[PDB]
Amino acid sequence: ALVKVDRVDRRYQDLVTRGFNGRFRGRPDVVYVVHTADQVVDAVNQAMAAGQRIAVRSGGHCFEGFVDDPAVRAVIDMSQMRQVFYDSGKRAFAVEPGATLGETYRALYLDWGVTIPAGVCPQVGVGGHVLGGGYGPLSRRDGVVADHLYAVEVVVVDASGRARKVVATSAADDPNRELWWAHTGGGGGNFGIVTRYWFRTPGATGTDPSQLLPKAPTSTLRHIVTWDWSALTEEAFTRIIDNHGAWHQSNSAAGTPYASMHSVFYLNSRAAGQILLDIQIDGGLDGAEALLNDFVAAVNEGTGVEPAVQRSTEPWLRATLANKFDTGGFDRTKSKGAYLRKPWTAAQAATLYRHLSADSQVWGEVSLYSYGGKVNSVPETATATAQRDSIIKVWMSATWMDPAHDDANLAWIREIYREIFATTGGVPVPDDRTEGTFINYPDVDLVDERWNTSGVPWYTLYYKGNYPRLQKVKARWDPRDVFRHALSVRPP
Ligand SMILES: CC[C@@]1(O)C[C@H](O[C@H]2C[C@H](N(C)C)[C@H](O[C@H]3C[C@H](O)[C@H](O[C@H]4CCC(=O)[C@H](C)O4)[C@H](C)O3)[C@H](C)O2)c2c(cc3c(c2O)C(=O)c2c(O)cccc2C3=O)[C@H]1C(=O)OC
Numbered sequence: 337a338l339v340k341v342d343r344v345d346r347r348y349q350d351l352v353t354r355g356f357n358g359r360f361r362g363r364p365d366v367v368y369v370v371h372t373a374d375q376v377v378d379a380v381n382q383a384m385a386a387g388q389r390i391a392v393r394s395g396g397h398c399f400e401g402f403v404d405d406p407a408v409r410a411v412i413d414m415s416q417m418r419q420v421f422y423d424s425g426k427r428a429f430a431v432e433p434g435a436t437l438g439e440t441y442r443a444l445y446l447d448w449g450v451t452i453p454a455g456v457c458p459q460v461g462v463g464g465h466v467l468g469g470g471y472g473p474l475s476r477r478d479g480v481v482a483d484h485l486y487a488v489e490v491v492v493v494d495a496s497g498r499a500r501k502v503v504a505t506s507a508a509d510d511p512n513r514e515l516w517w518a519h520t521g522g523g524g525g526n527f528g529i530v531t532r533y534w535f536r537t538p539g540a541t542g543t544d545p546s547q548l549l550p551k552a553p554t555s556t557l558r559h560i561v562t563w564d565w566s567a568l569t570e571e572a573f574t575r576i577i578d579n580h581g582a583w584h585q586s587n588s589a590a591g592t593p594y595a596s597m598h599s600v601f602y603l604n605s606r607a608a609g610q611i612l613l614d615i616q617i618d619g620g621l622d623g624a625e626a627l628l629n630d631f632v633a634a635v636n637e638g639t640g641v642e643p644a645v646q647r648s649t650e651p652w653l654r655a656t657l658a659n660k661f662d663t664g665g666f667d668r669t670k671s672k673g674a675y676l677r678k679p680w681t682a683a684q685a686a687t688l689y690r691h692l693s694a695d696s697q698v699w700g701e702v703s704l705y706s707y708g709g710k711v712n713s714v715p716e717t718a719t720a721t722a723q724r725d726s727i728i729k730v731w732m733s734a735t736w737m738d739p740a741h742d743d744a745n746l747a748w749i750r751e752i753y754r755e756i757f758a759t760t761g762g763v764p765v766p767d768d769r770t771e772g773t774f775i776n777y778p779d780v781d782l783v784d785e786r787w788n789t790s791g792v793p794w795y796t797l798y799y800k801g802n803y804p805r806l807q808k809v810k811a812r813w814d815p816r817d818v819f820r821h822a823l824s825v826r827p828p
């Protein structure tokens with residue numbers, strides 16, 4: 337289909353409210369619904385000629401709703417572009433940005449029995465997920481998704497003011513390899529518009545597609561372990577915390593049995609009823625069941641309370657395609673993350689318990705992700721995802737329904753964060769204990785001095801020593817600063 341232009345058209349509301357986060361709703365003059373890269377070129381050229389500030393939506397999961405900022409006048413929506421295929425020529429797999437993770441997972445698996453180590457949520461977009469290095473349950477095993485990025489097709493704009501389509505590959509002799517590099521965890525609205533991504537494991541021989549990317553697990557064995565809040569004490573919570581963290585520091589970053597395990601520890605508040613440890617592993621590996629109960633046995637060894645355990649073995653795709661991320665009306669969110677190099681302290685664990693145990697008036701939680709593994713095998717400088725020596729990733733949030741309570745919710749999430757990172761100035765500064773935070777977790781509070789961040793800039797936080805190299809890319813492929821937003825890479 338030819339390019340579509342949505343201006344005071346009946347399709348407007350639907351397009352402007354596609355964002356995941358109900359807090360931010362767009363008001364651009366127009367939305368362009370694109371179907372080909374050439375259409376993307378046209379749309380860009382039309383907005384520049386109208387001086388419409390551009391934004392791209394693929395998946396709409398942007399936690400900070402950047403695309404829906406009131407300064408945006410042009411929104412290019414890629415949701416009609418979700419083609420996925422293999423190219424025998426290129427020895428690579430075709431995936432368009434409009435595709436959902438759930439769709440790519442299903443297409444890659446059924447035709448070839450393979451996958452990519454991407455995120456968990458099935459409705460997440462490929463478009464703004466891969467270029468910032470979205471990770472998931474198989475990262476431990478196979479690394480970041482961008483560890484399997486061969487090439488990217490992008491629409492960029494000339495110093496002369498011209499939109500152009502360009503291809504950037506990971507070949508050493510490719511003059512655009514720095515553009516490819518930029519797309520391996522530089523993040524979303526900075527370098528142009530990706531129209532197609534190419535995947536192949538750098539260690540991949542031959543012409544057989546089934547052996548050109550990691551193979552899906554035989555099955556998914558799951559244990560959900562839950563501990564009720566009423567039987568939880570500050571002391572037992574802390575043993576659990578300290579126990580969890582000591583294990584993650586001993587068990588990861590290699591190609592071992594436990595490299596294939598993933599867990600999320602949902603540290604819910606005292607309204608939620610319980611804290612939940614959600615663990616999974618390939619049901620086809622030897623003594624699979626044994627590694628899982630050995631881990632939880634390590635998790636609550638010095639504890640005073642005994643958890644519940646629910647076990648199940650399901651087909652990998654079925655388990656993978658659960659829409660168990662139901663918003664349930666509570667569509668407003670605020671969140672903030674961190675990369676841990678070493679476990680929380682005695683004091684941080686205690687910050688955690690008090691703020692979670694409290695009769696807050698808001699739905700708060702702390703999630704801890706098992707991490708490391710194969711991701712830690714790539715040199716920090718080898719991709720634009722620098723964080724390559726962390727053992728756990730954390731994501732903290734508040735979720736609500738009524739905008740009248742934005743103030744109470746916002747207060748909550750900021751307070752827990754600043755307090756556990758208080759010894760630095762309320763932020764996870766890359767040092768011997770952390771490695772900053774994750775670009776797909778934007779937090780514009782990182783640029784507010786009337787809060788946290790003591791002495792360290794936001795870009796140190798997200799990219800460490802990799803930022804200058806990203807600045808030089810910004811200048812070469814987007815000299816006119818056509819692609820920007822609040823937490824945007826700046827030219828030097
Ligand atoms: C599941 C049922 C219910 O809990 C749903 C809802 O709870 C959230 C929890 C998550 N959140 C945003 C952190 C979930 O995010 C998702 C998507 C996210 O983007 C997250 O995904 C991660 C996963 C991995 C990543 O790396 C990363 C950051 O994203 C998360 C794991 O799950 C999701 C959207 O749902 C919820 C409920 C009940 C109440 C609230 C809820 O939010 C309330 O918020 C609330 C209140 O504010 C005031 C009074 C009462 C209540 C409630 O009773 C339940 C329900 O709705 O059924 C009726």
Ligand SMILES: *Cc1cc2c(nc3c(=O)[nH]c(=O)nc-3n2C[C@H](O)[C@H](O)[C@H](O)COP(=O)(O)OP(=O)(O)OC[C@H]2O[C@@H](n3cnc4c(N)ncnc43)[C@H](O)[C@@H]2O)c(*)c1C
Pocket residue numbers: 356391392393394395396397398399402403414433454455456457459460461462463464465467469470471472523524525526528529530531661776777821
């Ligand atoms: C909603 C949500 C997000 C999740 C979830 N789980 C994740 C996980 O398991 N691992 C992760 O690593 N990340 C997870 N995320 C967090 C992230 O939001 C996602 O990984 C992605 O950011 C989602 O991207 P997308 O859905 O495409 O959202 P958009 O708002 O459209 O884009 C975000 C960002 O990217 C830019 N952008 C979009 N499209 C393009 C193109 N084609 N080219 C360049 N840049 C693009 C946007 O402008 C914006 O800046 C689980 C849940 C439920």
